[PDB]
Design a protein around this ligand. Structure first.
Ligand code: CHL
Ligand code: CHL
Ligand code: CHL
Ligand code: CHL
Ligand code: CLA
Ligand code: CLA
Ligand code: CLA
Ligand code: CLA
Ligand SMILES: CC1=C[C@H](O)CC(C)(C)[C@H]1/C=C/C(C)=C/C=C/C(C)=C/C=C/C=C(C)/C=C/C=C(C)/C=C/C1=C(C)C[C@H](O)CC1(C)C
Ligand SMILES: CC1=C[C@H](O)CC(C)(C)[C@H]1/C=C/C(C)=C/C=C/C(C)=C/C=C/C=C(C)/C=C/C=C(C)/C=C/C1=C(C)C[C@H](O)CC1(C)C
Lengths: 217, 165, 194, 205
């Protein structure tokens, strides 16, 4: 098997049939958090949700960020998108935050009750009729039905590969967003401009020169 | 402002105290030479002093009638008026490190109770095991809430209670 | 089996054959369960009838020249008075709201008490069609197909007026004027990167 | 038995059934047979669009230097987006995506279930023959009576010209980004002086 550190002793809780059947297992647990299988279950759920929302957010940063260097899509910088949006908008930000709290709390409550009980949300008479297709698909965190419309999740031969691509791209996306934050506080411009200013002069413009990222040198 | 005071930037007493400290310091400085290490240390003190006053003025501190900074210990009030860095952030920092120390210690104790002589490994520290557990708990709060939610944090009533009632 | 929405692909197992508009169209597997499927049949037919009525209404309004469907309710926010075919309507917004609430509440409660019934009879059959239950199945098929078409057309109305702000027949007229010069690529809000 | 490196060990999963099987995969991209199928179909499609593209960049420019007078007088291949047509490019994009949605989803439906998209939905007499071969349709898509010969030769030829055309279109992109000129003019100034017009020569400016 692959390991993060070849030659390192892989911990015994990440070496089970239950833990090796997880997407993107690389035996990485230096701080031994996942000693409890229930806790490992919950943490896997946390990783999946963070992956999906991280991909969505970072794509939202990049793709308008890239395409604005072309002609179309005049988009302001991601750290200024809220202001301009709310000046474009019709309501104050408080009411928008309240509405999103409601509409997201409902859904997250659903998903949470499905985490505590696996076959929960599908029981007769609960919803007006989507109770038909709100069960799980035998692997928690990966529902079916109205999710996965295109039927890509039906074939069994591509299954682990779709999983593994998801988790790898997601981990990379989380790293990307943390990078967005740090580059915002460090240099003071958009990430696309950081990429351009680094490709323009690599040996002079990096975090060894920005004067904040390591002040002792 | 916040309970009848003013920020230190326009506080008259602040600048008077600053001038007084510089005055005594230059008074000590006067009697030496211009190359002497006494004068070197004295000018270092001047630099650190003026830098300290500028740093306290920059952070938006609040001074009473004595010209001294006052800390605000109230979540709503400090978070509303921009003072989260004087009690709030410090208390979460301290709780993190203190729970960290306690959790590491507790894990050591359970790690050594399972041996043949628990007292020797208490008087003579198992250094490899101690360093190992010293790393393994940097995220303690997650392990703490898991131990709480599984009911292993608390012993049941097999504790020795005083006799009699 | 009125058809198959995707030649070659197998029909879903949960759709029963004797059913109007049974094309086997279900990628999401939404009607795999019985009771939910029955409820969805009810909802589809009812939405179809209401869509037919609304689309026919907006067409009649614009075709007989009384503004669009968007400025029919214009008389209530900006002060004025309702109309029908060239005659004034003597009511207030709250008056029609009250009579609408009472009438619709009464009618829909009455309907919503007889279990789930989609085809009544007798006094909702006053002309004498669908008596033999033979060609009634075909009439069910025609009903549901025209209903699906009406729903799609009404969603078209909402999107079209949300895009260009003109009425249906006005949009069709100008599109017949210059076909390539004005449709949903000259929209400027449909496809963004143009 | 041909190789891309005569003597070197070929990967075991390649067996000559694919057209143009030269045993070239130093990154081992096609170990799973499913990925091999998808990659093969992708190669065919990329190849055909490359061949049509390179034809559509050579032929207008080749017939530009000869001096005809259709309004495509040699403007460019990359300046095809600033010309007055008889329709703005938006509706072009719309009709394009509608028609190609129809065609490409139809083709994908053939690929997932081979032997299922053969007959004409409207005029249900017209039907493709049962020589399905996902990626090689047949019937009216081979209208002039070919495929009579040993088609492995013609498949091999199609894939060779496709690979050459893909590299050619990559060439058009690279040359037009670097020198910023038309490609037959690049061949013109290279046939003018082959020894002082090279890549190493131009990249030192
Ligand atoms: C949750 C992620 C999130 C992040 C990283 C940001 C980022 C930002 N928003 Mg923002 N927002 C975020 C969620 C939202 N915003 C807005 C609507 C706005 C507006 C109107 C404005 C911002 C502004 C800001 C900036 C300053 C606000 C601040 O002090 O941050 C503290 C809050 C967080 C760090 C989020 C908590 C995690 C900062 C760059 C301001 C700005 O752009 O100035 C340059 C500004 O006017 N946002 C909404 C809709 C309610 C959000 C939904 O959750
Ligand atoms: C009156 C007491 C009462 C309370 C406190 C709740 C509270 C709840 N109900 Mg509930 N219900 C209650 C009565 C009833 N419910 C329901 C039928 C349902 C359904 C079908 C669902 C809930 C759900 C919920 C949860 C929504 C959580 C959330 O984040 O809301 C935030 C969202 C809003 C505040 C606005 C949403 C609009 C929450 C636990 C949802 C759930 O399952 O959560 C796990 C859900 O799907 N309830 C019926 C009819 C049988 C009730 C009759 O008394
Ligand atoms: C997929 C292959 C393809 C290639 C290689 C090109 C080539 C190009 N097109 Mg394009 N096109 C392509 C697809 C299509 N184009 C067009 C219609 C147009 C138009 C109208 C224009 C281009 C332009 C461009 C240029 C974009 C460069 C830029 O900086 O834009 C950034 C700027 C904008 C996106 C604005 C580039 C030379 C532009 C051009 O020719 O400028 C020199 C231009 O005006 N194209 C259509 C029909 C909808 C296409 C359909 O596939
Ligand atoms: C109402 C739901 C419905 C939906 C979403 C579809 C969707 C589809 N039908 Mg379909 N149909 C539907 C109802 C029906 N169809 C058909 C009869 C057909 C036929 C004969 C064919 C399709 C085809 C298609 C496909 C065209 C794909 C494409 O790229 O379009 C993009 C193209 C356009 C948007 C314009 C084409 C003009 C697509 C999967 C084609 C197919 O087989 O694809 C694999 C095809 O040949 N349908 C009938 C009558 C039996 C229907 C009745 O409800
Ligand atoms: C869930 C992730 C996410 C979130 C929260 C946002 C949030 C936002 N996007 Mg956005 N976006 C995302 C993903 C996301 N994006 C992705 C994946 C794409 C690529 C399709 C885009 C492409 C995009 C464009 C092209 C634009 C926005 C804009 C906006 C802003 C206004 C949104 C609005 O008015 O719509 C309701 C808002 C800050 C607008 C903006 O930046 O205005 C300030 C805008 O013009 N987004
Ligand atoms: C140790 C107890 C204690 C005490 C005496 C106070 C005292 C105060 N808090 Mg407070 N607070 C505390 C703990 C405490 N805090 C803690 C632990 C939190 C974190 C949950 C907060 C979070 C908080 C917020 C978010 C706000 C206050 C505010 C206030 C002020 C008026 C409200 C009040 O007295 O409610 C009585 C308080 C208690 C009985 C103690 C329980 C703590 C509750 C949760 C705080 C109640 C907030 C209150 C409902 C807000 C009223 C709004 C006001 C405009 C009327 C007052 C100076 C408000 C403020 O800024 O005033 C200007 C305000 O907005 N507090
Ligand atoms: C009013 C909504 C509605 C409802 C509830 C139904 C219900 C049904 N249809 Mg149906 N249908 C509708 C509208 C509707 N139809 C329309 C408008 C068309 C024309 C496009 C069709 C065409 C159609 C075919 C061709 C077939 C069905 C079939 C069915 C049955 C099984 C499928 C199922 O589980 O449906 C459940 C449906 C829903 C839960 C729909 C809810 C709406 C979803 C959740 C959101 C849609 C959002 C929309 C895409 C947004 C567009 C915005 C725009 C800007 C892009 C079921 C009785 C099958 C059958 O046997 O017929 C009886 C079948 O083969 N339908
Ligand atoms: C006020 C009295 C009243 C009452 C008591 C009822 C009662 C009923 N109606 Mg009903 N109806 C009424 C008025 C009323 N209606 C009016 C005025 C209309 C418009 C003419 C309709 C249109 C209507 C349709 C079309 C349907 C019903 C249905 C039903 C039944 C479902 C009950 C239920 O749980 O729904 C609870 C419903 C809700 C809490 C609201 C659902 C809101 C939906 C999901 C949002 C739709 C999108 C929204 C409109 C935004 C669109 C924007 C637009 C620009 C496109 C029930 C018997 C359904 C039925 O018979 O199925 C069995 C059905 O299909 N009714
Ligand atoms: C593994 C492990 C294990 C062992 O045991 C121990 C240790 C080592 C400690 C660990 C590690 C860990 C880590 C590292 C983690 C990380 C994380 C992250 C980064 C996340 C993020 C994450 C991230 C995320 C989600 C993100 C998201 C985002 C978003 C939404 C965005 C949004 C937006 C947009 C769109 C745009 C607009 O305009 C604005 C805004 C609003 C801004
Ligand atoms: C089927 C399926 C299946 C699979 O599985 C999945 C999926 C695909 C998702 C699905 C789909 C779905 C869909 C598409 C749906 C649609 C719907 C609609 C559109 C409705 C409408 C609906 C609509 C409707 C009713 C409408 C109605 C209307 C009306 C009444 C009107 C009214 C009016 C009038 C008197 C006139 C005036 O001037 C005004 C007004 C007031 C305006």
């Amino acid at each position: 098997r692959q390991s993060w550190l070849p030659g390192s002793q892989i911990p015994a809780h990440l070496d089970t049939p239950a833990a090796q059947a997880l997407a993107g297992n690389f035996g990485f647990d230096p701080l031994g958090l996942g000693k409890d299988p229930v806790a490992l279950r919950w943490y896997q759920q946390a990783e999946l949700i963070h992956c999906r929302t991280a991909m969505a957010g970072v794509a939202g940063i990049l793709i308008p960020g890239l395409l604005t260097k072309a002609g179309a899509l005049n988009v302001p910088e991601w750290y200024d998108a809220g202001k301009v949006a709310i000046e474009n908008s019709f309501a104050p930000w408080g009411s928008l935050l309240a509405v999103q709290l409601f509409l997201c709390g409902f859904v997250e409550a659903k998903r949470w009750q499905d985490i505590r009980k696996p076959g929960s949300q599908g029981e007769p008479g609960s919803f007006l009729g989507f109770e038909a297709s709100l069960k799980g698909t035998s692997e928690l965190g990966y529902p079916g039905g109205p999710f996965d419309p295109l039927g890509l999740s039906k074939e069994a031969d591509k299954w682990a590969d779709w999983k593994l691509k998801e988790v790898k791209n997601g981990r990379l996306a989380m790293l990307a967003f943390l990078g967005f934050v740090a580059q915002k506080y460090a240099t003071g411009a958009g990430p696309v401009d950081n990429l351009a200013a680094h490709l323009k002069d690599p040996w002079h413009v990096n975090y060894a020169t920005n004067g904040v990222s390591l002040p002792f040198l | 402002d916040i309970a009848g005071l003013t920020p230190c930037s326009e506080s008259k007493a602040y600048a008077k105290l600053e001038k007084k400290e510089l005055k005594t310091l230059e008074k000590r400085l006067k009697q030496y030479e211009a190359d002497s290490a006494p004068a070197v240390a004295l000018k270092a003190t001047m630099e650190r002093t003026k830098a300290r006053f500028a740093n306290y003025a920059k952070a938006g501190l609040l001074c009473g009638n004595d010209g001294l900074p006052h800390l605000i210990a109230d979540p709503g009030l400090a978070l509303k008026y921009g003072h989260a860095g004087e009690v709030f952030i410090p208390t979460f920092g301290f709780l993190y490190v203190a729970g960290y120390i306690g959790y590491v210690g507790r894990q050591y104790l359970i790690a050594v109770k399972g041996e043949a002589k628990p007292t020797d490994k208490e008087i003579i520290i198992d250094v490899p095991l101690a360093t190992k557990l010293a790393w393994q708990g940097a995220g303690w709060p997650l392990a703490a809430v898991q131990e709480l939610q599984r009911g292993t944090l608390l012993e049941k009533e097999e504790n020795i209670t005083v006799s009699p009632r | 089996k009125a058809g198959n929405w995707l030649p070659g692909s197998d029909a879903p197992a949960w759709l029963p054959d004797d059913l109007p508009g049974n094309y086997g169209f279900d990628p999401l597997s939404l009607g795999k369960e019985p009771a939910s499927l029955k409820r969805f049949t009810e909802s589809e037919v009812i939405h179809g009838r209401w869509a037919m009525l609304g689309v026919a209404g907006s067409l009649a309004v614009e075709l007989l020249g009384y503004g669009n469907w968007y400025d029919a309710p214009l008389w209530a926010v900006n002060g004025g008075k309702a109309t029908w075919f060239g005659i004034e309507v003597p009511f207030d917004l709250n008056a029609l709201l009250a009579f609408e609430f009472v009438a619709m509440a009464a009618a829909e409660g009455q309907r919503g008490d007889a279990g789930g019934v989609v085809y009544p009879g007798g006094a909702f059959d006053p002309l004498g069609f669908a008596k033999d239950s033979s060609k009634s199945g075909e009439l069910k098929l025609k009903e549901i197909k025209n209903g699906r078409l009406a729903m799609v057309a009404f969603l078209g109305f909402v999107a079209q007026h949300a895009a260009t702000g003109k009425g249906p027949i006005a949009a069709l007229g100008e599109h017949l004027a210059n076909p390539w010069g004005a449709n949903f690529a000259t929209n400027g809000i449909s496809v963004p990167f143009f | 038995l041909p190789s891309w490196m005569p003597g070197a060990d070929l990967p075991g999963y390649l067996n000559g059934t694919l057209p143009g099987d030269f045993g070239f995969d130093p990154l081992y991209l096609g170990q799973d047979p499913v990925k091999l199928k998808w990659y093969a179909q992708a190669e065919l499609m990329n190849a055909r669009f490359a061949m049509l593209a390179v034809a559509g960049i050579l032929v207008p420019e080749l017939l530009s230097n000869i001096g005809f007078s259709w309004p495509g007088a040699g403007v460019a291949w990359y300046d095809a987006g600033k010309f007055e047509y008889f329709a703005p490019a938006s509706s072009l994009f719309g009709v394009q995506m509608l028609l190609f949605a129809w065609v490409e989803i139809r083709r994908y439906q053939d690929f997932v279930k081979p032997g299922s998209a053969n007959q004409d939905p409207i005029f249900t007499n017209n039907k493709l023959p049962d020589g399905n071969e996902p990626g090689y349709p047949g019937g009216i898509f081979d209208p002039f009576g070919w495929s009579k010969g040993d088609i492995k030769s013609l498949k091999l030829k199609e894939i060779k010209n496709g690979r050459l055309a893909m590299l050619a279109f990559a060439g058009f992109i690279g040359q037009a980004y670097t020198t910023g000129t038309t490609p037959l003019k690049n061949l013109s100034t290279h046939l003018a002086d082959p020894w002082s017009t090279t890549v190493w020569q131009n990249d030192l400016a």
